[PDB]
Symmetry: D2
Subunit: 374 residues, 4 copies
C-alpha cells in the first residue's frame, strides 16, 4: 500500500517477477499473516502455491523445475514475500535458499535429480540443520555424531532452532565424522529421525522451528553432500548466500512498516512525524540499494564474505529500528494487536540473531578486513 521508492532499474525480468510475487503475496499471504502468528503455525497450502509459481527453486536449475535465476532475483521474491508475512518469508528462505540452493550447488547430478523436483514443486519441504544446543555461534564445536557403519552413516545427537524442522521432508544436516565435518542429505522417512514440537517464539510465529533428534539414524553413504570432511567449506559458502538472500527479510519488513504507517497517517502534517517518516523512507531506500548491490555482485561471481555479512548486519538492525518507529507513529493503536506494527517488531528482531548474530557479523567483517589489508 506504500509503493513510492527509488527505481533501481533491475531489468524487465526482475520487474515482472516482482509484480508477480507482489500480487501473489497480497492476495494469498497477507490475509493469513495475523492468523499464522496467532495460531503459531505455517499455512501449509502456501508450499505448493509458491511451488506452482516457481518461487521455491528460483536459484535452482531449470532441469528440476527451477527458474535458473540469481541472487538479486531471489532477494526480490524474498522481499515481496516477507512484506506480506515475515514468518512465511523466513520459512521460504530456509527452504529455497538454505536447503534447495546448497543441494543445487554441492549436490551431485544423481542427488539433485533425486531430491530437487519435489522440493521445487513444494511437494516436499526443506530445511538446513547446523546449530546445536551447545553449538550456536560457535558452530564448529557441534557434537552430532556420524559414524560410518557399512554402506551407512549412523547419526546420533541433536540439532536445535531448525526452521521448517517439524515439516521438512528433506534436510541438509551437518555432523562430525571426525572430532572434521560432513554434510548429509537426510530424509524425514529415515528411521531414527524425529522432530521435536515447535518452539514458542517472540516473533516469526508463522515459522515452524524445532529441535531435531537423531537416534541411530541411518543415512546412505551416497547421501553425503560435498564429500567427507569437506562440510566446513559447504557450510561457509552456505552462510554467505544465506546472508545475502535473508537480508531481504528485513527489506520486506521495512516495506511493510511503510505500508502500515503511510496510509494510517492519511486517515488519522505534524513536523516531528514528517521527520520520522523521512528517516524511514531514506533508511528503506539505502538498505535496498546496499542489498541489491551486494546481490548483483554475487551474481557476477565476486562473492565476498565481508559485504554479505555487512548487508545482513545493516538491514537487520535497520528493520528492527524502523518497526519501533512504526509502532511509535501509530501511537496507542500501534501498541495494539489490532494493527500489525507490533508483529513487525517481534519478527524483525529475529534477523539480528538468526543466520549468525550482529556480534558475529561485525567480528567477521573486522577480522576479514584486517586479514586482507595486512
Amino acid at each position: 500500500m506504500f509503493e513510492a521508492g527509488l527505481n533501481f532499474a533491475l531489468g524487465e525480468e526482475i520487474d515482472a517477477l516482482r509484480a508477480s510475487v507482489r500480487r501473489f503475496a497480497s492476495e494469498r499471504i497477507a490475509p493469513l499473516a495475523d492468523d499464522a502468528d496467532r495460531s503459531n503455525a505455517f499455512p501449509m497450502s502456501l508450499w505448493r502455491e509458491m511451488g506452482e509459481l516457481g518461487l521455491l527453486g528460483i536459484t535452482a536449475d531449470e532441469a528440476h523445475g527451477g527458474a535458473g535465476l540469481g541472487y538479486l532475483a531471489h532477494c526480490v521474491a524474498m522481499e515481496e514475500i516477507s512484506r506480506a508475512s515475515a514468518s512465511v518469508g523466513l520459512s521460504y528462505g530456509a527452504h529455497s535458499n538454505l536447503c534447495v540452493n546448497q543441494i543445487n550447488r554441492n549436490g551431485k547430478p544423481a542427488q539433485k535429480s533425486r531430491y530437487l523436483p519435489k522440493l521445487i514443486s513444494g511437494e516436499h519441504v526443506g530445511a538446513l540443520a547446523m546449530s546445536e544446543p551447545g553449538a550456536g555461534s560457535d558452530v564448529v564445536s557441534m557434537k552430532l555424531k556420524a559414524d560410518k557403519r557399512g554402506d551407512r552413516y549412523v547419526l546420533n545427537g541433536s540439532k536445535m532452532w531448525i526452521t521448517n524442522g517439524p515439516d521438512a521432508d528433506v534436510l541438509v544436516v551437518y555432523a562430525k565424522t571426525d572430532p572434521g565435518i560432513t554434510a548429509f542429505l537426510v530424509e524425514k522417512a529415515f528411521p531414527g529421525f524425529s522432530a521435536g514440537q515447535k518452539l514458542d517464539k517472540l516473533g516469526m510465529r508463522g515459522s515452524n522451528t524445532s529441535e531435531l533428534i537423531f537416534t541411530d539414524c541411518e543415512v546412505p553413504e551416497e547421501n553425503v553432500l560435498g564429500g567427507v570432511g569437506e562440510g566446513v567449506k559447504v557450510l561457509m559458502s552456505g552462510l554467505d548466500y544465506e546472508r545475502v538472500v535473508l537480508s531481504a527479510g528485513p527489506l520486506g519488513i521495512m516495506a511493510a512498516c511503510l505500508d502500515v504507517v503511510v496510509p494510517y497517517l492519511h486517515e488519522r502534517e505534524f513536523q516531528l512525524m514528517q521527520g520520522k517518516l523521512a528517516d524511514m523512507y531514506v533508511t528503506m531506500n539505502a538498505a535496498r540499494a546496499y542489498v541489491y548491490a551486494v546481490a548483483a555482485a554475487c551474481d557476477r561471481g565476486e562473492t565476498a564474505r565481508k559485504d554479505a555479512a555487512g548487508c545482513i548486519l545493516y538491514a537487520a538492525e535497520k528493520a528492527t529500528a524502523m518497526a519501533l518507529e512504526a509502532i511509535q507513529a501509530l501511537g496507542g493503536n500501534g501498541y495494539t494487536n489490532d494493527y500489525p506494527a507490533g508483529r513487525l517488531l517481534r519478527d524483525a528482531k529475529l534477523y539480528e540473531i538468526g543466520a549468525g548474530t550482529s556480534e558475529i557479523r561485525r567480528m567477521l567483517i573486522g577480522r576479514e578486513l584486517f586479514a586482507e589489508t595486512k
Copy 2:
C-alpha cells in the same frame, strides 16, 4: 538477582522500603508475571496484598491511612514492583499515583475521607481518565440541578474495567473550561468497554470508558470548576516522575536476566561474558541503568522539595522510557536464540517497555513540551 549499582544514599527509611517491596515483588509478583501476560489479565488478589503492605497510599496523608511518604519513595516502590512485573507496575502506578495522589493533593477533606480509605486498603481500585480518541477534549459535563451530567468517552484507561473510583477530566465550558470529577463505578450511565489486546503490559487491564448521561454529585468536583487544567498539569508532572520508575524497573530486570546468562552460557570454550563485545554491551547497559536512576531520583527529590520540575519530569520519563526499550532489545540480543523464546522473559521486557514511549504521553509530546518551555522560559 543483579545487584551491582551506584549507592544513592536515599536514607534508612527508603532503603528499608526498597527491601520490603523487593521481598514482596520477588516472592509474590514475579512468579505470576508470565501468567498475567499470558492470561491477559490483572491478578486481582494483589490489590489487597499491596494494600496490606501500605503501598497503595504511599504518598497519601497518614490522616486518611496513607504512608505519608514522597515521590522519591514512590519511585523506589514502583521500580521494585516493575522489576518483577511491568504490568503490575503500570496498574499500581495508575492506582497509587494517577488516582490516589490526585485525590490526596486536590481533594477537600471530605472527598479524601470518602474515597481514600478503600483505595488505600485495596478494596477499591482507582484510575484516571483524560485521553480521548479525538486538552481539546470533548467529554461534556453539564449542570443538572445539584449534579453534573457527563457525556462522551475516554480511551486507553489503565484499570479501566476494574476501577471503582476514577478521576475524570471533562469540559464544563467550551480552554480554561475544564473540570476534574470524582466518579464511582456505581454511578449509573458509566461503563467500561472491552479490555484492550496489547503488545505488552498484557497483565494490566486497559479499556475505554463510556459516559452516558452519567450523574456526578456537585460535591464530587475535584479542585474547583473551571480549574481542571491546573489539576491536570500538576497531575502530569507527578505522573511522569513516578511512572519513569517503570522503565527503571524494566532496566533492572534486563540486567537480572542477562548477567547470570553471561556467566552460564559458554561458546568458544568461554563464558560469553568474557568476550570484548559482550563486555562492552554489558558496560553500556550498566552505565545507562545508573544514569537513568540518578536522573529519575534527582527529579523525584526535587519534587519532594516542592520545586518546579515540568521540563525535568517530562525529561526523566522521556529518557528512561527510551533507554528501557533499547536495553530490552540488548537483553534479547545477549541471550540469543534463547532470548527470542517465550520461555525467557526478555521478549516480555521489550513488549512492556515500548508502552512507556507512548502511554502517559508520547516521546514526541514530551520533546515538544520541553523545547517549547525552553524557547519561552
Copy 3:
C-alpha cells in the same frame, strides 16, 4: 590508501574516469590539502589543471568543451576529488555543478557560448548565489530600460571572492528570476573570505550588489521563472554534492586501516581487539551502503527519472554518516588522531559542513517528509 570495497560495476568509462581522477587527485591535490587548510586559501592553479582534464565541464555540452557525461560520472569525479581534499571538492562542486550545470541546463545557446568555454577551461571560476542573511530573499532586480539593476546582498557563497561568472537569484517582483552576473559588472563586489571550522581551502564570502547593472540577455531561464530554475538542480546539486561526504568517508578509511596494523598495544596490533574490529566493520559497512545509495540516485537521475525525495535523502544520509565516521577515525587513531599531524581532525571539520551548508539535515528531513505525505 584503502581501496577495498564492493564493486558496483559502473562500466569501463566511469572506471577509467575514476582511475584518472584518482591519479590526478593524489598527485596534485593531496600534497596541497594541509596547506589549503592552514592558509585558508584555494590553490588557484588547480582550476586550469582541472580544466585541462575536462573535469570542470564534466556534465556540460561537448560543443562548449564539456565532457557530455552524466551525474553518476560527476559524483565519481567529485568523490575522488574530495577524497584528496574536501575543500577542493566543495569548490569544484560549486563551480562544475552549481554554476556550470545550471548554465548548461537553463542557458540559451548564446549564453552558453558566451559563458561556458572559460568556465570549462578553468580560465574563469563559477559560483551560485542564492542564500541571503535573512523564497524570502531580498535581493532586488529593478527593470530600468534594457537593464536590470541589482541591489542587495548574498551570503555564504562558495568561490565568492574568485568567481568570474555567477548564477544569482533575485526578486523582480514581490516573482523570482535567475541572472548571469559578471565579476566585471560595475556595482558587484565580493566580501572577504570567511574564517570557517573546516572547508578552509574553499573560498566562501558574501556578495554585495549596489546598483549592479545586468543586461536583459543575461536573464537565466525566463523572468519570474527563477524558482523552477532553482528547484531544478537543487536536486542534481544534492546528488553531486553527496559525493563530498563519500570522498571524506573514503579518506577516513584511508587513514584508519593502515594505522590499525602499525599500532600495537598489549602485544598485538590494535586491529585484533574485538571492539576495534566492531568499529572498523561499522565504518566499512557504512561506506558501502552510502556509496550504493548515492550511485543508485545518480543513476536514477541519468535515466531522467524524478528524484526529489531521493536526492535530498542521499545527501541527508551521506552527510550524517561522513561526520560520524570522521569521529570514529579520530577515535581509532587515539592521541595521534587528536593531533594536526594526522588528517583525521581536518576530515571531521570538513565533514560537518555538509549537514549545515548547501541545505541542512533539518530542511532535507522536512522536504522529504512533506513530499511523502503527511
Copy 4:
C-alpha cells in the same frame, strides 16, 4: 548571555557558594580569553596565581597545607564552571589540581606534602602527572644508585608538560608489580620537556612529551612506596575520571550557553525539529549532571568504584561530543564559523573520549569488573 536553567541538585550552601564564585571568575576572566588561548595555542599562565588565590588549585588538598579540604563533588563543580568558560583551562586545571595535587595529598608523606603542596596550591608552581608512553607495560626506567633513583626514558602526551614544576612520574623499578611513583622537579638536571603538541582542540592546554636522561631523583621522593606504584596509579585513575568527567559537563553547559540565546534571536517545520533537538540537549545535560554528581558524592562518602568513575566519564565524554555537534547544527552557517565558539566546543570535547583512557578501555574495565563481581 548564559543559560542557567536546569534541575536543582541541592548540593548545599557551601557548594552553591563555590559555584557562584567560580562562575563569576570563569565568565569574567576566563571566557574573554578562551578564543585567545585557542588561537595562540598557549595556556594563559597568569591564571595560575589567580586560581591559587581563589582556593581552587588545592580544593581537595588538606587545609594544613593551604588547601580547601573540600571533596570530589566540590571539585567537580569547580571543574565544571571553569570548563564551561574554556575547556582548555579546565583540562590544565584538572591535571594540576587533581592529577598532581590530589595524588600528592593522598599518597604523600607529611614531609613530601609540606615540601611540594604549598607552591602548587598557591599557583606559584604548576603540577603535572606523567604515566603514558609512546609505546601498565611502560618502559621508563628507574635504577637505584646509592641514595638516588636514576631515571631514563620518556613520557608522552603530558598535560602542563612544558610548564610543570612538580610532576608525579611513574616508572619501572623492576621489570618483573615493579612500578614506583616519583615526585620529580623541573629543576632536576637531566629532565626536559619536548615542544608543545599541535592539537585539534584543547589548544590552550600545553601538552608535551617528557625526556629523562640520567635524571637523578632523591630516594625520599618516592611516592607511596617502592613497587606500590600500581596501586597509586589505579586509585589516581578513579579520581581522575570522576573529576575530569566535569570537563564534558562544562562543555555541555557551554553548548546550551551558545545555543539557547541564539535560537531566540534567529528567525527564518525545521524549527519543531529544532525544539526536539533542544529538548534532547537539555535532558542529556541534566542526566549527565545527575550521574557525575552521584558518583562524586559516592566518592565523598568513601565508596569509590572503578566501574562508576569509568562509567560517568565514558557517558559524559560521549554526550558532550554529540551535543557540541548539535550546537553547531543549531547555529547553522554561523555555527560553522570560528567567530562563534561551537566549533571549538566540538574540537575540545573530542579529547575526553581519548584522554584519561579511551572509551574502549573504559567499556572493557566496566565489563570485566561486572563479570568479576557477579561470578
